[PDB]
Design a protein around this ligand. Structure first.
Ligand SMILES: [Mg+2]
Ligand SMILES: [Mg+2]
Ligand SMILES: [Mg+2]
Ligand SMILES: [Mg+2]
Ligand SMILES: [Mn+2]
Ligand SMILES: [Mn+2]
Ligand SMILES: [Mn+2]
Ligand SMILES: [Mn+2]
Lengths: 387, 387, 387, 387
């Protein structure tokens, strides 16, 4: 019941089920997984593919011969299981050299190094069949006001992304970029902190068509924002290239709980939106099995991610197909929201006495919106109190 | 000492000092102010100008006869004091007809009425010499997920702003629009909730050059965001058309405290940024004197807004003029942040062996950033524990 | 299906369904309800009783004859419907005289007035059969640091509550007090901001046995706290006298959505706790039907409060009775949490080599807690994915 | 200028300046410090003393032989510099055995081990002259609702603290316990999450006089609470045994910035309260120099903690000494707040017609509170815009 299949396009980062449980206050509680074991276990649970940072697969500072042997094992595991690699990314945050950032580090030589590290892994991503390259600028930011001139840093960030668009264009690579926003942690404030800031930044790049967003449930909620609303704005702009699914309990540290946990009604409205919009990209889980768990709990947590999506997908479809919800949407005038305000045009609007001179504002004000019934129907469907 | 003059460009909304103290849990504590009296008292305090909603100046429902008397009195008060009207805006949130929004109400007739109400006040704003027209969509949004399809709502919001841009260009008006974001309150979630979301939305308008942002200190802080960082991104995009200054203590209801209150160091870094970037627009206070105050406290609170700006301006200037701070900025490599990462081009960067193959990452990782020394110098300057 | 009955002990404040929709930015959207109509409508929906502020029932400044006629109508409506009045409270926040507080107003004469207003309504509460008297100190606090010496204010707050305990003891009234915490709004910070602060304060009253807490879902969540955890601490201390149920979407203004909305999984764990602890007080909804709604939406919202509680009660009971959840609780050692750590006593613990000298910390560390399976079983039960 | 001396009682944890910079997303940026070197560097900066976790001083797993050498070296360093050890604490959060807690772990054998580990370090703390023993239950709590029955967990926490109180009283030790609250991180929710919750819990211990709180600036601010207000309630209850000073920017991960950073006006009001109440304990800094810094920045950040305290102390003293501020305090009736509301008794209050029957509420409502003038004087004093 609610069994995931590869057609559901569920993907996992190597670093998700691979997380050893080291947090700001504690040591690791689990040993490291071989990426090959991760690929095989995830295939048996019904996953579609896996994603990776360069440093998840290739030990930092590996020689080229040493790099080749690491890829070849991962290689074979993907071949054996039919697992795809739809997305890859760069670790520009763990090594101490990135303590003030990669692309916007104050030191110029670190910025050049970060670009070279990124470009090497783009090559590898394309070889493995990745269609999306994610950038999470986790160290781009500041703890204090004078440490970072944000106008200069945005110049440096634009320069880096423009150079990367140049590289893939010169190589003829069929790959797009997705910026993953986060408001804070591990920096006090991170540049491009929300979906909105990232969307605005993309419009100033030299070729904006190459760049989209990879929003994460928990990151927008870390700013108290409505995640389905932000996803709707990304869809409206044509910029939802990828998505990170997990759970988060409000405004605190980045929890990365399994999808479904955290804010359950936001999860319901998110799945309703993705499915009714026909989003066809990967459903990627950027989550961390809590460090209380042994490895059997790791795979239970990963399976739970996939199961909760499938349950919510079923309830959202039942909600939209219910004839009673039908009528309630018409009663709340959702179909009128979808109609133009003034397709007659500006001149006609200015000459329409019914729009102002003779508009009965008191009668219009008395009309109820009937939102609370509509919402209780949605609650009933989520909880299985109707079908 | 720290006395404002009209040259400082301090402006205030009629609705700020005119707030009667009604909050969700309590009735008014102050009598209503005559707009003419506000203009005169504000001029006596050293203000540069005043701003208004249509309904602050002209009582809602006023006959075309009564509307003319109200503007005449106000124009006369402006002339007698000198005082300017740099910006105006529409009240699309108080009357019950707007309970589901103005531009994005589900009911089409409400949406047409909201546009007609706005266009009438654009005409009045231009006659009074306003250069900026502000839109705060306080009722655009939702409490529940099914009540608003956000993709349709963004279509309607774009339709509204495109029509307004058509109107002003057809009349030859030399006015620009500024969107004022806010994440929530009075709606559970408000559309375009942060500076970034509004900046992104503007790029999809038909004539994006006509539109910028009017960010408010407290509104970005209601999402836990760094207001100076968000202002920097607006400046970087060429979109800071106007600014609302006030105070806010973190993530809670919108407090609208006087400027300087709330987060004091963020106010310092904001004034440093505005003054160093050469922002030339109004320094506008969107604040509410607390309802504990009588009219003497109203005027004391308004004077405090201006005074705190002027103190912070002095300390930020002293900070940037200090040779020891200039040293510390070079020690933290802020000057290198301003340097192109790779003006030598993509190919040169790829061939530069010093950027990767022979980059000593451990030596680079060992470099201290000297940020804490720089920040304590900024502390000392703010507190006047050095000159 | 999921039909409320008076035995479920659901209660509503007159001010909940009576809320006219006036918020900080908008006028009322609904006319006022006669308390008699409220009592009759709520009885037909299956409610158990109603609660009131003095000012909900008796217009402020009513004469004694005028007071008598208002009570007599309410009176008869309760008699006709069998509705109970289990709780009442005082409005010490709406009138401008309370702008700096009631019990902790700086002005001594206002503090005496607040006590006299409270004592009059205690008499009325007892006449109507109330067993709990709630105090929400909504104006007790400050916007600025110097306005309120909190040690002096806590002295004044203790003095007020001690005097009230004296009054009911002298009159022989069978009634208890419950303090309703809230962290902020309408004051910048409110004294006793959380359940914990209120519990601590009660221990310094002259007769602590007379005082408990009335926690509200949304208020604890306004501080980002775990509401079920706080309710557990109140139960542990023997202090849960009353509870306010509603919904809240994280850290923002006090939304007072209908119960079930906001944080749905917290609602599930709250009902699980209340039912398994055998809480026998009223299930009181302190909520506000959104101002988008007409009166038919008001009653739909109120019915939804009751329905969601009953659905969650069913899912929580099914969760606890599931033999698979059974085993999972034993697998996660919840029964071991309920056993003493050292019932053998201090001397035996100090002499137990297995507790330290010979404890195998590495073997103990390797044990998984199996929390993620347990939690996915709970998710499955909430969503009706198992029975 | 603003130079610390041992008389100022500034103390630092070994783990503060000794933090190597490991965060959830990054490896260490600094080498480990020898405790003897920290003691000497801190003494050179003007510190009064140092504090420690057992595992900061003695490497975990040390033989009883190796443990003695470590303490001897440290005692010698203390003697050479003078330096005191006013408080000590137990690390019950780093080792993986504590992944579900120490005192409230579901596994009983872990709970017994946590007690034995703590009791060993109490003996060491007393030998080094510590007067306060701090407990931060960083791992007590949960990520999911069913993992922890909080009522049983509070039974186990009380059992643990009662046993510790039995131990110290049986040995004749003259040490007191201080509970350090925190709302979340590293657990999703931590038990006893705020100052109020811990104060309430203490009153249910067997010997409550032995236990107080160790509040931390950033931890209360992680719940959006007013830290000076919470300190005032701890003082009012006689329970402020110790304090942790640092900086935090609002509701996010625990930043542990140096004191003065974060919320600057709250730091001012905190220092005003501590100094005016005559708090005599240590001024302890629980902070982390940012991982961007080298060892020069570590020491600069520590010096900044002390310097910012001393600047704020001067400005708060000037504020309270200013005759114009004393005037403003009387104008705001702070002196009347300090007056008993009804020292004449319940019966006299009931018979006082001036308190209700003849109280002119509209005249009282008209009184301005003059809070904004008072607060701007406090501003001026903090910024040194008056003397
Ligand atoms: Mg992510
Ligand atoms: Mg504003
Ligand atoms: Mg309530
Ligand atoms: Mg601490
Ligand atoms: Mn995350
Ligand atoms: Mn505002
Ligand atoms: Mn509430
Ligand atoms: Mn901390």
């Amino acid at each position: 019941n609610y069994q995931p299949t590869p057609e559901d396009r569920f993907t996992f980062g190597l670093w998700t089920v691979g997380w050893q449980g080291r947090d700001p206050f504690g040591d690791a509680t689990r040993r490291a997984l071989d990426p090959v074991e991760s690929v095989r276990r995830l295939a048996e649970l019904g996953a579609h593919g896996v994603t990776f940072h360069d440093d998840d697969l290739i030990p930092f500072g590996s020689s080229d011969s040493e790099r080749e042997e690491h890829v070849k094992r991962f290689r074979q595991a993907l071949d054996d299981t039919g697992m795809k690699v739809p997305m890859a990314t760069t670790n520009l945050f763990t090594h101490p050299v990135f303590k003030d950032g990669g692309f916007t580090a104050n030191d110029r030589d670190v910025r050049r190094y970060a670009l070279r590290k990124t470009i090497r892994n783009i090559d590898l991503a394309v070889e493995l069949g990745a269609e999306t390259y994610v950038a999470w600028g986790g160290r781009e930011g500041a703890e204090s006001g004078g440490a970072k001139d944000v106008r200069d840093a945005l110049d440096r960030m634009k320069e880096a992304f423009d150079l990367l668009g140049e590289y893939v264009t010169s190589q003829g690579y069929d790959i797009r970029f997705a910026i993953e926003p986060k408001p804070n942690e591990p920096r006090g404030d991170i540049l491009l902190p929300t979906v909105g800031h990232a969307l605005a930044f993309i419009e100033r790049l030299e070729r904006p068509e190459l760049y989209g967003v990879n929003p994460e449930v928990g990151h927008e909620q870390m700013a108290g924002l409505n995640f389905p609303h932000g996803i709707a704005q990304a869809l409206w702009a044509g910029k939802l290239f990828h998505i990170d699914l997990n759970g988060q309990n409000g405004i605190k540290y980045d929890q990365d709980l399994r999808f479904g946990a955290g804010d359950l009604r936001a999860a319901f409205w998110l799945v309703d939106l993705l499915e009714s919009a026909g989003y066809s990209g990967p459903r990627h889980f950027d989550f961390k099995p809590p460090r209380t768990e042994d490895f059997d709990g790791v795979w239970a947590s990963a399976a739970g991610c996939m199961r909760n999506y499938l349950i919510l997908k079923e309830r959202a479809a039942a909600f939209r197909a219910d004839p009673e919800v039908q009528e309630a949407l018409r009663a709340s005038r959702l179909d009128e929201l979808a109609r133009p305000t003034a397709a007659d045009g500006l001149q006609a609007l200015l000459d329409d006495r019914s729009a102002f001179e003779e508009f009965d504002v008191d009668a219009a004000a008395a009309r109820g919106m009937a939102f609370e019934r509509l919402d209780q129907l949605a609650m009933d469907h989520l909880l299985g109190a109707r079908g």
